[PDB]
Amino acid sequence: RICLKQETTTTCPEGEDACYNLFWKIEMGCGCPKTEPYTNLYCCKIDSCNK
């Protein structure tokens, strides 16, 4: 999996299948944060899906 990044494209580590876009603050990257506070959260499992 590859994901857009802002905290560029980055390749996630093996096993991290999702990408995410979090708004509270703007973050983009690998994974899908489960514990992190957000206002809008978007996770998707396609390459570069998290704009």
Binding-site ranges for its own copies (CB under 8 A): 32, 34, 38-46, 49
Single out the residue of 3, 19, 22, 32 in contact with Cl ion (rule: CB under 5 A).
32
* Residue 47 in the binding site for Cl ion (CB under 5 A): yes
Cβ burial of 51 (10 Å; 0-12, 13-18, 19+) is exposed
Name the token pair of 50: 């998290």
Shortest Cβ distance from residue 44 to its own copies (Å)? 5
- Number of residues that this document lists for the chain: 51
> In this structure, which amino acid lies at residue 35?
T
Residue from 43, 47, 49, 51 binding Zn ion (CB under 5 A): 47
